[PDB]
């Protein structure tokens with residue numbers, strides 16, 4: 494990891510439900526909007542009982558393009574997932590893992606760390622939470638962010654759908670990093686388990 | 688040997704075909720792992736068409752089922768569900784089967800295996816492995832709460848036939864055994 498660098502990073506970002514936090518103008522956003530593969534690592538605390546809370550999304554926010562996006566999300570039941578979409582006629586690749594994260598511990602909102610990697614070489618997606626590899630998906634027709642049509646935004650804490658903040662998170666994004674590099678499972682186990 | 692097999696079952700769009708009373712249905716309703724192989728011809732433009740389902744058809748339990756389905760866009764998928772709070776494990780693969788081709792309906796063969804030891808699901812269509820899913824928390828049909836039916840051509844949801852297929856289920860076989868990838872490439876060809 495000594496010479497690995499993120500293409501986009503943010504730290505210490507509070508977000509109330511429905512507000513989101515726009516990253517579209519950040520240096521590095523263009524790179525994120527074109528990823529063919531890579532790694533996303535996010536530490537957060539959720540204060541929200543919303544059922545589906547996007548931590549990070551990248552997609553097409555325009556009218557009629559509401560099924561064209563990627564997001565990495567958590568749920569109110571302690572689930573972690575992702576969706577990678579370009580309308581269902583093109584692709585809808587998803588993961589949803591139960592009982593992988595926690596909202597609270599000893600009456601306090603607890604930090605969790607999750608990660609997703611997408612590896613073009615072996616057509617594989619892997620999801621991690623809190624020190625564990627929780628799911629692996631292989632697709633013959635591999636896709637990633639550069640396959641979504643008309644990407645125009647990157648954001649924390651929701652997914653833009655026809656100009657509305659969908660899948661709204663509340664709480665704190667403690668640390669968020671996006672890499673073009675595909676990090677090893679050992680690295681992701683270590684960073685998510687810390 | 689299969690635990691349940693049927694051949695030449697033609698289904699009017701929306702009706703389904705109940706297998707719940709067949710010999711072997713109990714075993715299918717309790718599978719911890721296994722393999723499903725289905726050759727079919729669809730004659731329907733319905734968006735989502737279950738080929739085979741196993742689930743809980745009772746009121747309030749509409750998210751408790753397994754099905755292997757095709758779509759009108761040439762997709763193949765499966766969902767394994769016991770309400771989203773418990774599990775929702777899915778696959779959806781584009782451009783894997785044909786709904787029609789040279790203005791004609793056409794046969795396809797698909798397969799799904801669920802492998803408990805490897806904690807793995809693999810989906811096949813027409814001689815190709817199209818997706819693999821590995822879940823740390825492996826589930827299958829015996830983890831669904833209140834299974835009470837097995838059907839071709841739809842999924843029972845609160846007493847309604849959801850995801851309705853129309854056409855012919857040419858051959859369907861369900862195994863408790865986990866077939867090899869090579870065997871599934873061959874049988875789906």
Ligand SMILES: CC(=O)N[C@H]1[C@H]([C@H](O)[C@H](O)CO)O[C@@](OC[C@H]2O[C@@H](O[C@H]3[C@H](O)[C@@H](O)[C@H](O)O[C@@H]3CO)[C@H](O)[C@@H](O)[C@H]2O)(C(=O)O)C[C@@H]1O
Nearest residue numbers: 544545559560566574575576580581582585587659734735
């Ligand atoms: C993470 C997750 O569950 N995301 C799904 C999302 C959420 O469950 C809800 O938004 C939470 O309220 O639901 C999505 O589906 C709902 C929409 O479906 C649209 O129809 C789909 C149809 O179901 C597909 O079979 C078809 O291929 O595409 C249609 C068009 O998108 C309805 O038109 C729309 O009104 C909603 O009901 C969603 O996109 O919001 C699916 C997410 O995977």
Ligand SMILES: CC(=O)N[C@H]1[C@H]([C@H](O)[C@H](O)CO)O[C@@](OC[C@H]2O[C@@H](O[C@H]3[C@H](O)[C@@H](O)[C@H](O)O[C@@H]3CO)[C@H](O)[C@@H](O)[C@H]2O)(C(=O)O)C[C@@H]1O
Nearest residue numbers: 544545734735749750756764765766770771772777849850
């Ligand atoms: C193969 C497939 O696409 N299956 C999905 C199915 C189909 O897209 C549609 O049925 C085709 O018309 O849609 C399902 O979701 C629709 C229902 O969602 C319900 O709310 C969900 C909510 O979206 C989840 O986030 C939550 O965890 O669970 C809720 C309760 O199920 C609505 O209550 C209901 O009215 C439908 O809109 C479906 O179950 O039918 C999801 C399938 O994966």
